Design a protein around this ligand. Structure first.
Ligand SMILES: O=C[C@H](O)[C@H](O)COP(=O)(O)O
Ligand SMILES: O=C[C@H](O)[C@H](O)COP(=O)(O)O
Ligand SMILES: O=C[C@H](O)[C@H](O)COP(=O)(O)O
Ligand SMILES: O=C[C@H](O)[C@H](O)COP(=O)(O)O
Ligand SMILES: O=C[C@H](O)[C@H](O)COP(=O)(O)O
Ligand SMILES: O=C[C@H](O)[C@H](O)COP(=O)(O)O
Ligand SMILES: O=C[C@H](O)[C@H](O)COP(=O)(O)O
Ligand SMILES: O=C[C@H](O)[C@H](O)COP(=O)(O)O
Ligand SMILES: [Cl-]
Lengths: 223, 223, 217, 218, 218, 223, 223, 217
């Protein structure tokens, strides 16, 4: 399962990549604008992210109409081969995904809330579908069930579109995504960091290191 | 399923190895502290185990910082081809695993208590991941359920990291691990011994021998 | 299933109670300390909640010793008939619960993280037990499974202790609690606010008023 | 399982009750106005349905404010004891339901789309909750799953609120409602009529008529 | 589980009752007309069956129209209190069932092929519903699944209508009906007879006899 | 679950009753004739069994025709109120069971090999049905599945006829009968005796008694 | 579910009893042998436990013969109303249980390793049956499955004998027992202690106290 | 699924082999001692079976020590290419199996009562492992469940050791073994004899010959 960092913060990105557990990045104008402070320019942020990240970097199109979407998507693509254009599940979005797929521009269909929407995006040629699980949870539907059904559908037809679990709110979204077999999850840095933690890890390490001092007062390992 | 012996006790290790049922050994700083008493030095213990044992021998770094982990890992690796460097599930540990994996040094990520920690370790490139089933049992959670989930997750993504079930307390941990399909179990010597035994084995062998005496008073099979 | 509000924020409590969907309130030392700032005293905050809220209000002791817990519990109890004394799941806590129960003082055992802790609390005679689902989720364990097991265990032994699902983070904790059959959920204000809402209700409402304008301008 | 007819057509209603499979009626302004043709007073329609039906007749309030809802509800109640006041799942709706409940006026909470909304209505004391399964189907979610969850939840808490499956589109919504154990379904007349039919029933009827005219040509 | 004989042959009925495994009888025009020979008239056969059988005897109407159905039904009832009137699942049928049950006349709704039809008949007050499982098998639908669903639905609502599995073709329809918990099966005499048989029973009898001859050659 | 002893041996019966786990007896002419040795008369055997056994005692009718069955059954009944007349699943048997049930003579329908046969016997008023599980096993059908289905059928209709599992061959027939909820099993004395045995019981008792000698050399318990 | 303490250690018993979480005590000859050393007499130990403990206290006979079991059972019973006589699953043990049950002496049948042994003990009239889950685990069989079957069997027949899960080794035996619905578990002191504990309990309480200090430097709650 | 005959009775073996449904034979010290009576020597019985039976024939060592087992195994092996050396599941047995395996001598690990013992035998390189289902049944445990778990474990690790179900008591052990997918069953003669039979086959045969007599006297 790939993990994308949902942020535009370059320090967070570098740190996560160094942990060896970050495979790409998902952005939006809000996340980018957040970093555009103290001299940093909006466009400079996205360009640096595209440069330093080996993997996929998702960038949203703001145009809501077909022509604007494709023209914008082409400009985004021009910024880096690893750019992935984020396009909403709408009639014009599907048309744009079909057109962009033909041009070999990678795409990410967002605002997916049921499995058939996900399937339609895959049929139009989309690279990723991003169902928003936390937003389904918000309205009293278990959002992970939609991920499970999409996984089954995609498996049934050997669909190559990747499931990108989005609107992630907690570590159990991540656990269930992994057990289901979702291709990717995107998570904020704080969620990412929480994924490696457990109180028995902390307690266990403290005990090991206490015991080691019995055999090595300086706490060293000399070999 | 491989069976490793979870101990730093040399006598236990030579004995198990001779039964031909031991495929490797796992140590940790606590186990080594039990052994390095009354003049015995930890460095001598580690070298001796690497010597006696043909299979993988896990030895845990003690530094909690990236650079110290890597440095100690390289020294451990240098002691013999069968050495496997054990690294805790921490931020620095993941960094170390990524680096050491790129250097083709075999690694074992320890103090794992949930399936997502296991997945992160695998993503960082770890050779083995060691979830602690008995310590989960200790806190009122069925530890084997975590092994089942890790197996499912690893299968989903064709992950090559080996699942090494640790903190094993009884033969049912071993049985359930085998039925789940974990790659390795590491067991304490008392548990290892018990695996070979069953009262009906004892009783059946006694009866065979009693019946054989009717036909051969000396108890020999002369062909 | 009762629904309690998990906060010491008086504004939130007034708002939720005015909506008519709050059956009680839970507080803890963190929540209260959060509100007791810039001149506001924890004692006034506690008294205010007890008066505002008709239903059960849980207030947690801070002593870690048996004697201190029972002493504090009696003071909490004396603040009003709706006060429920929250007691942590510790050895001294179980002792305090047993004593408080025999004195007919309502209790709520908190910081419960597995079903056997919950059972121990019930055996001590606790009125409510509050397992923390969100904190289990935080450490990579599906917290709701613990609620499911506690419900089964309590059903097996006809245990009268109410299961009070706490550390709730989202409306699916709530949905799953109701499907399991937990007695009570306690929810943060942001969660409470969402429970009545659905986008199809909104859409349906809009459509209704439009249909009606046809029938009758 | 009770079956309500979701319309204001009096002929449809008589017909269904005569079949002995109609226990009540659910209306709304749209449905009532439909019958308000050729000299028929809108209010007359509602009043006649109320008179003829020996069971619950649901009539919706149009006010969105608590105070308008309860005044409107009391007036609706005054039209017949079998009147049930339909009120939407909103903050003011729940408040109104709680008030009307205490006044012993029967209520029906509508526009419910998940089980927790249904539980909130139950907790307000509502007589019926009406989840809209067809509208859930419309948006790619199997609406009957919500009914199944509400049935379990109501069972858990011995809730006396009746589950009234609404927005029904086909006979399988009905079959699944019955297998789940929902208390009530409300269906359009065309759905109602289709419920009694099966091609093997038609074939069997023709076969029995033919078999019979061997036994007796006359 | 009650067992009714699907016949109008008195000798078959008497023998079945003597085995203690027959609780009633189901007829139709064809079955009665088969026995209506050699002086015996249609009406006498039905009267003789009604008298001898200490249980329900189902007799079918031939009218397809409401009024005719009820007229017939009242005549059939007059023949004896144990008489049960078969009525098809149709609009007029439901109407007749509602009317007859209100008059405390027992009814059996036939030509039921799905669970909702069964529910409708129950709602109209029918005493028995008779889904035809063999005819469902005939068209590539596992008939017993329908009995299963009807059992679940009837259980959900504590429905007192009895499920009477009809169109039985083999002993597995019977086994499955009993495992499901259907109230009644009706079977021809030949199926009834087959129900008692098993080759290990026959083998065991022969062994008992041989074992006994050793113990007591006499 | 009641346990009947399938024997005519009076010593076995007394012994099993003393264990508190025998509730009645099932016989047949073969089992009775076996005991009719060294002066003991066939009829004396059955009469003594009827006298000493509090619970039910099953006795087979040998007549295959209705009139012979009922006349024989009445004579058996005349021997003791606890006599239960064993009658095969045949057309004449069903007629006899119906007649005998009316006379309040208890009956046991044997040679039952499917669930519907069992149901027919119950409808005729039979006290027990005896399906022969071992004989189904003999022909490659799992005989316990028939018991399970009969249990479900009987439960469905609150049938008061007792399921008497017969042709029992091993302790797992007994275990599965108990888990299913069969009313009764009938077993030979040797099977009965085997039911209380387990090697860990033997080993555990030996260990307890060895340890007790540490605190009580004479092995006594003086209180 | 009742919780008994499985020990003859007086200090452990007084401590557990004070936590108010202990509902009774189970002993056996081994446990008593651990305690009756250095001058301490077994008779004094038994009497002291019966004294300290308000709930049932099981004490095991040592004779292997019917008459000795009954005689010892009567002496045990005579020591106090809360005494429960423990009897092994043997031929003589079943005889003893039948007799003692008729005398209204509470009994506990021990060394049970399968569900049919448990059923036989219940049929003989035993008050409690004690299956040994850990010793089954020891021989490679999941001991809890036997508890599940006994629960099902006892439910089927409305058996009033209490299931007392014994040979408990860890908190998951306890958890599974509760979920199954066993009447009683008896646990070693170390296991008992662990049942109350969880790392998130410790961490949560520490944080509450830290946060409270912001509002009350003395850490008191003054109302 | 192969079917072996579990006996040292030469009459039974000849009879079963003549039926063409016996693929091999298993013996053990008890079975052999049963036949080696009244002048008949165990050595002659063993040699006779090896000659009569074309398929695998298992003969069990009697030494309990590693050296004695290997010595006896080599002698057994030298009696014929179809000989399989049966070795008990003990510490010395596992050592012997590992040595015998490296020497390309076929082995059969017996007295196995749980799936982990079976796994250990496989890890030592054993050709066949023989769990005893009937002896488990004897002690109140459904022996077939152990076969099901061993099949799962062996499937998980692509283990080539054949599962040889032993201590078989009835045809349902056999049916269940085949449905699970065990490689081999070994059955006593009384069981073997029953496997081809069914009362409906007999009846069907009788009916066929009667129908045929109509068609053609
Ligand atoms: O692509 C990223 C999405 O915008 C994000 O994951 C959704 O965030 P929210 O649903 O939590 O607002
Ligand atoms: O990898 C080995 C682990 O450190 C070890 O198995 C932990 O065992 P414990 O939980 O018994 O200390
Ligand atoms: O009883 C209430 C608990 O103290 C509270 O729900 C904990 O919530 P949190 O874990 O989300 O802070
Ligand atoms: O209460 C009845 C509802 O108004 C009706 O069933 C809605 O139907 P629709 O969702 O098909 O418009
Ligand atoms: O009531 C009896 C039914 O009419 C009968 O069983 C159905 O028979 P058929 O469907 O085979 O005609
Ligand atoms: O009533 C007893 C039966 O005859 C007996 O249990 C069956 O024995 P068998 O089937 O093993 O021959
Ligand atoms: O009843 C108590 C048992 O004798 C005890 O629990 C056995 O425990 P052990 O298996 O640890 O010896
Ligand atoms: O491999 C064969 C075993 O030794 C034999 O099958 C044991 O059979 P039994 O347990 O039925 O004697
Ligand atoms: Cl353990």
């Amino acid at each position: 399962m790939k993990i994308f960092l949902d942020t535009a913060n370059i320090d967070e990105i570098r740190t996560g990549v160094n942990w060896g557990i970050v495979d790409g990045v998902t952005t939006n104008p809000t996340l980018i604008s957040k970093e555009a402070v103290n001299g940093k320019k909006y466009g400079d942020i996205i360009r640096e992210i595209l440069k330093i990240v080996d993997g996929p970097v998702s960038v949203e199109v703001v145009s809501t109409k077909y022509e604007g979407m494709v023209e914008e998507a082409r400009k985004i693509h021009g910024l880096g081969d690893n750019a992935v254009v984020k396009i909403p599940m709408t009639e014009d979005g599907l048309r744009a995904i079909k057109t962009l797929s033909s041009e070999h521009i990678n795409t990410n269909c967002t605002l997916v809330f049921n499995p058939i929407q996900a399937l339609l995006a895959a049929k139009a040629g989309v690279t990723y579908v991003s169902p928003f699980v936390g937003r389904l949870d918000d309205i009293g539907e278990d959002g992970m069930q939609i991920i499970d059904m999409i996984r089954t559908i995609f498996n049934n037809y050997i669909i190559k579109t990747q499931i990108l679990v989005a609107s992630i709110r907690n570590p159990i979204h991540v656990l269930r995504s992994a057990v289901i077999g979702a291709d990717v999850v995107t998570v904020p840095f704080n969620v990412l960091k929480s994924l490696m933690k457990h109180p028995k890890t902390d307690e266990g390490l403290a005990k090991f290191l206490e015991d080691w001092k019995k055999v090595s007062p300086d706490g060293k390992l000399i070999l």
